[PDB]
Amino acid sequence: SLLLTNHIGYERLGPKKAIIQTEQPHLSSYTAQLICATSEQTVATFAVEEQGKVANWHQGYFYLIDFSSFTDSGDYFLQVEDSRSSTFTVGEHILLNQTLSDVIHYFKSQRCGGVFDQQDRQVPVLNANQTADVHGGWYDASGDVSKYLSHLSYANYLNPQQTPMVVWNILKGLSLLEGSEDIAAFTRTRLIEEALFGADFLVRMQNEKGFFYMTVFDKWSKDTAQREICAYETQLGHKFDDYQAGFRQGGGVAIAALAAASRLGVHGEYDQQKYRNAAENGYWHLKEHNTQYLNDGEENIIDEYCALLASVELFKATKETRYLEESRLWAQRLVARQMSDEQIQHFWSANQDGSRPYFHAAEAGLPTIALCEYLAIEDDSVQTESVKCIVNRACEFEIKISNKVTNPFGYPRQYVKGVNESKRDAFFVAHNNESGYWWQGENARLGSLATMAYLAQPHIASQEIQQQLSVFAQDALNWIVGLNPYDMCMLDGHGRNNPDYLPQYGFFNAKGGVCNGITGGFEDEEDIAFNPPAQKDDMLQNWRWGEQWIPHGAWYLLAIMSQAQHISQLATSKNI
Amino acid sequence: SLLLTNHIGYERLGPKKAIIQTEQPHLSSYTAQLICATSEQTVATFAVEEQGKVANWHQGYFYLIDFSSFTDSGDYFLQVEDSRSSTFTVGEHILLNQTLSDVIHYFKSQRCGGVFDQQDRQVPVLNANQTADVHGGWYDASGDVSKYLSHLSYANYLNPQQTPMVVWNILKGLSLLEGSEDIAAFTRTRLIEEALFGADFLVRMQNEKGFFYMTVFDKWSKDTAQREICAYETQLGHKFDDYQAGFRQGGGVAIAALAAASRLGVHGEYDQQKYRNAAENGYWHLKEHNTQYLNDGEENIIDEYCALLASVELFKATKETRYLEESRLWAQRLVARQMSDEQIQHFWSANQDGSRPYFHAAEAGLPTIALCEYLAIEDDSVQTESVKCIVNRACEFEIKISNKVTNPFGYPRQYVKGVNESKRDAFFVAHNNESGYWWQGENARLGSLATMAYLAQPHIASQEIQQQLSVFAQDALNWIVGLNPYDMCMLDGHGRNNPDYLPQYGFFNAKGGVCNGITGGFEDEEDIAFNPPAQKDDMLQNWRWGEQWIPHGAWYLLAIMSQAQHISQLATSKNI
């Protein structure tokens, strides 16, 4: 019997949930006591609600305790009969205060250096008989010194935004807490530094033709001789020469990141003008050439939300009306990806007809964030309204697909499809997809969905739906930092049961970093897995759960800065 | 009632100690059970030995449990009647396996960057009407972005080896575990990278005249406008233009570090030849000019052990017999600092006559390490012997001064003297010294003493004294990672009760870093303190305990690599 909570803590004025997990079909007590950890006095009591089994999860029965109504600061634990939770804090900006600084140090620790960075001033561009200086940036994973704008391009619908997403997220977070006392001056300095570090690397990843390079890849060998600018395919990592980044292949966010970087009062190795020019050129190049870079030739949802971000940020920096038009273009095109069908109302589709739904292990909350970026730069009241409620429909879709089955954790559910299978709602991404191998923990996805939920809130009409989003987001954050079937905080250096990756080969997870996380089960996708016994030692498989990967950290970092902004915003409204 | 242990763990074949701390003058049970944490079965039982009060420490009564004889791997906790310890691991290379990687990431996270590093390519050299490019290196502390070879030069006997010590320690550790499978290949790569990063900075800190600059100082303002190459005095930080580093003022270790760096198969921004030349020139410059740079004019013990390191490393790299002569010179001069008196036999003296003993909050184990560096490069049997037993006498002095009063923790004790006070043995450094303000936690000192104890072991005759040193060293490591009156692991990100510095102003302690630590009490030096109530919020005082500082981490890192080498060495001897 486990009494699962957020290992770190809860917002004083926010949703507070705990889950009893046990094999008992019923309990002998249905009162929980919240006990002050210092004095050991019971400060409040709460009902325990039966939830039952979840899908085909092997952990047993789940019981909800809702302590949201408790609003006193301090350190506490929960207790029912058999079981006791670990000690959590209740207070303002708790995940911000406790965890942001360690995530920054995480990024700084993961910066490219030494024999890798030196080689990266002289990297072979595959089948081009030349060399590029692409030093800087971060290593991608705890087991990968390669540097990515994206990958999995050959699968078409899987493209994760990587290095530029890190840069965008920090800049976005910076702008959300700009002028607030939520973070300190030196924290701002440090975040600016980390953003500019990646910004300079994006500059270097741009060819003179205008396109950005997709990957600096080493075939996971850590051998500097094997570092080549390329694209790659399958799990075996066959290198090919289609290294030009499409909008969906890192290209779009690269533009957005550089554009956002250009608005700052200070700069990196390159100046604001250089960031701006690299952005503009990258954009119009892709306007011209995008479809030649995309493996299937067809632009999808990913192309559209990335391009939206690009064009929005470009408008903010240049103030040129043609970028507002580009934004209008990309918005309306993205809006058209929202479709209904037999099973679901108002989902996101990957392709044109809805035959393949959008589900993304890294950035599933990006469609709505991109649309909300547009709605902030759009000027007249009447133009916005067709998007304003497509936002509302998307938000409500997340909530409803997550309420469609038994879901005590509030794990954000999704509409998935395998190759040669029919569409289904699920907790986790489909294992049999267009990659032929690729699926992993979804901590970045959850960070993006939490971010989405916080950032869509000004554009939501109903106060009812707003507070459902506050629950939705907290649920996603709770999962990442311990409130999950595995009682595992996935942020390294905080809470407990931190997973390592492969320490026996010197691939250690780094303090402040977030690993992949929990998946659908390996044999049964309705089951749940984290290093399951049969795959745990299989080195071809064990990267899916325990390995860190920069999107996770970046998305978590944006999520907590988004959260902090939303919390500040509520307390601001309360005074007037 | 607390049952204090090492928060992380113990070597399977090593000293295993626990301490009950309570206000009870006697117990009701004097058997401890060691209980397997997984099964909760008692695996062995042990006697509890009364130790009593310690000095004037306010924590009460201490009881020893010695479980050294238990030699089975796994996770365990201790229990006696009232109290239960937290869960620790027993196994091979435990502090190495668990903590090294996080300390490296600590150093990488603390590298100079952004607005500070950019300014550091154009730093004002005080009263010199010019500018230096001294970019690179690490920030000194969690509340200080300044970069130091040393400081406190005006006090003469207090000079800590800082940035070059970091570089030396990593290189030393690298060489200790070279050819062993104790660390992984990628860990070696990462350590080499971190060493070379500081090596390049040392090159840049050398003037064309030959001397190294002492400090890049900002008056603790974090304002880049105030960054000036200088030296400084008092707590108020008055900047003066005596920035040339004497042997004792960072100069000597800088030479040693660069010399050691020059032996590596790979290099940083500068090559092996450039490291070597910078070392040679720095040395002979100080041979010529040292006494003009030292505030009092007189060379002391610190000058001699630093110079010894310099000349030894120079001999190893160049193979020139004149450096063996310099080593012989510095050795014999250092040996002469070992003096007896009324109170103590065979202490280390700071000045010539013994009127001021050597006690160092940062590097007290350096005299013996330096001598042991000499004994490894010296060729004929007869030359070494006068030093060989001066080593033995120094080791035995540490042990005996630490046994002179009640000392359950095995905290390394020292011979101290205040200004206008007579000499005394103590646990902690004297508060009223030649600085007029400066004293702090001694975690680096303990790391160096542990290192000393491990590295002096081949040069110790008696097997009896060797195993006392194994106890001595482990005692020092145990203190740093939780076995202390405060139940506080001082390595951030590990064990529990990690202290922060000043998070409300954005001065956060970083994962993988070691803070200052525990001191003598503020009003009573026979008492003990860590953020005591009266000074805790005093911002002029609270830096002494909770602030991180790079020597601590570097010395801890060398200590655990030294430990790992010693452990490997024992298991190697057992087969033959």
* DSSP calls for A223-270: -GGG-EEEEEETTTTEEES--BPPGGGTHHHHHHHHHHHTTSSS-SSS
Secondary element (H or E) of residue A356: none
Per-residue b or e along B433-455, where b marks 16 or more CB atoms closer than 10 Å to that residue's CB: bbbeebbbbbbbbbbbbbbbbbb
| Per-window interface: A 407-436 vs B, CB < 8 A | none
The CA–CA distances, whole Å, from A456 to A168, A336, A475, A567, B273 equal 17, 19, 16, 14, 59
The CA–CA distances, whole Å, from B10 to A154, B14, B77, B103, B558 equal 50, 7, 12, 19, 17
DSSP A317-332: HH--HHHHHHHHHHHH
Rounded CA separation B413/B426 (Å): 6
Cα radius of gyration (chain A): 23
Q: Which residues of B touch A185 (CB under 8 A)?
A: 506
Q: Which residues touch A303 (CB under 8 Å, ≥6 apart)?
A: A246, A247, A248, A252, A290, A294
The answer to whether A180 contacts chain B (CB < 8 Å) is: no
Rounded CA separation B377/A333 (Å): 74
Q: Which residues touch B372 (CB under 8 Å, ≥6 apart)?
A: B391, B455, B456, B458, B459
Give B111's strand partners: B138
Rounded CA separation A557/A551 (Å): 10
Give A63's strand partners: A20, A50
Out of A189, A505, A511, whose CB is closest to B105?
A: A511
Say what the alpha-carbon torsion angle B8, B14, B20, B25 is, to the nearest 10 degrees. -160
Rounded CA separation A75/B37 (Å): 26
What method was applied to determine this entry? X-ray
Out of A102, A115, A504, whose CB is closest to B511?
A: A102
The CA–CA distances, whole Å, from B547 to A511, B141, B223, B515 equal 19, 7, 20, 5
Q: Which residues touch B139 (CB under 8 Å, ≥6 apart)?
A: B110, B111, B112, B116, B145, B146, B147, B550
Give the β-pairing of B9-11 and A42-52.
unpaired
Secondary element (H or E) of residue A33: strand A31-36
The answer to whether A95 contacts chain B (CB < 8 Å) is: no
Give B415's strand partners: B425
C-alpha closest to that of A251 among A216, A294, A218, A208: A294
Out of B111, B192, B506, whose CB is closest to A184?
A: B506
Domain A94-576 has CATH 2.40.30.10: no
| A300 DSSP 8-state letter | -
Rounded CA separation B66/B20 (Å): 11
Give B231's strand partners: B240
Q: Which residues touch A463 (CB under 8 Å, ≥6 apart)?
A: none
Rounded CA separation B334/B325 (Å): 14
Q: How many CA atoms lie within 13 A of B405 on its CB side?
A: 15
Q: What is the resolution of this structure in A?
A: 2.3
Secondary structure (3-state) at B68:
coil
Q: Do domains A1-93 and A94-576 have the same CATH topology?
A: no
Give the β-pairing of B88-91 and B9-11.
parallel
Burial (CB count <10 Å: 0-12, 13-18, 19+), residue A82 = middle
CB B561 within 8 A of CB B101: no
Rounded CA separation A215/A229 (Å): 6
**CA B252 to chain CA centroid, nearest Å:** 17
Nearest-Cα residue of chain A relative to residue B192: A114
Domain B1-93 has CATH 1.20.120.430: no
**CA angle (B503 as vertex; B501, B506 as ends), nearest 5:** 115
DSSP A430-442: -SSSTTSS-----
> Which pair of tokens denotes residue B92?
């091979």
C-alpha closest to that of A14 among A572, A563, A381, A576: A563
Yes or no, beta carbons of A192 and B114 under 8 Å apart: yes
The CA–CA distances, whole Å, from B436 to B155, B231, B362, B444 equal 9, 17, 18, 21
Q: Work out the widest C-alpha separation in chain A, in whole angstroms.
A: 73
Where helices occur in B463-521 by DSSP H, the ranges are 463-480
C-alpha closest to that of B256 among B358, B148, B107, B149: B149
Per-residue b or e along B71-91, where b marks 16 or more CB atoms closer than 10 Å to that residue's CB: eeeeebbbbbeebebbbbbbb
Contacts of range B377-382, beta carbons closer than 8 Å, 24 or more positions apart: B377/B312, B377/B315, B377/B316, B377/B324, B377/B327, B378/B324, B378/B327, B378/B328
Secondary structure (3-state) at A301:
helix
Rounded CA separation A537/A531 (Å): 8
CB B559 within 8 A of CB B553: no
Nearest-neighbour CA in chain A from B372: distance (Å): 31
Rounded CA separation B537/B427 (Å): 25
Yes or no, beta carbons of A508 and B115 under 8 Å apart: no
Domain boundaries, chain A: 1-93, 94-576
Cβ neighbours, 10 Å, residue A462: 11
Amino acid occupying residue A340:
S
Per-residue b or e along A390-422, where b marks 16 or more CB atoms closer than 10 Å to that residue's CB: bbbebbbbbbebbeeeebbbbbbbbbbbeeeee
Secondary structure (3-state) at A364:
coil
Secondary structure (3-state) at A180:
coil
Cα radius of gyration (chain B): 23
Rounded CA separation B62/B196 (Å): 45
A vs B, Cβ pairs < 8 A, gives 85
Rounded CA separation B139/B149 (Å): 11
Out of A114, A184, A186, whose CB is closest to B189?
A: A114
Per-residue b or e along A524-533, where b marks 16 or more CB atoms closer than 10 Å to that residue's CB: ebebbbbebe
Rounded CA separation A182/A193 (Å): 18
Rounded CA separation B32/B409 (Å): 18
C-alpha closest to that of A83 among A53, A63, A55: A63
CB A17 within 8 A of CB A68: yes
Secondary element (H or E) of residue B284: helix B272-293
CB A489 within 8 A of CB A477: no
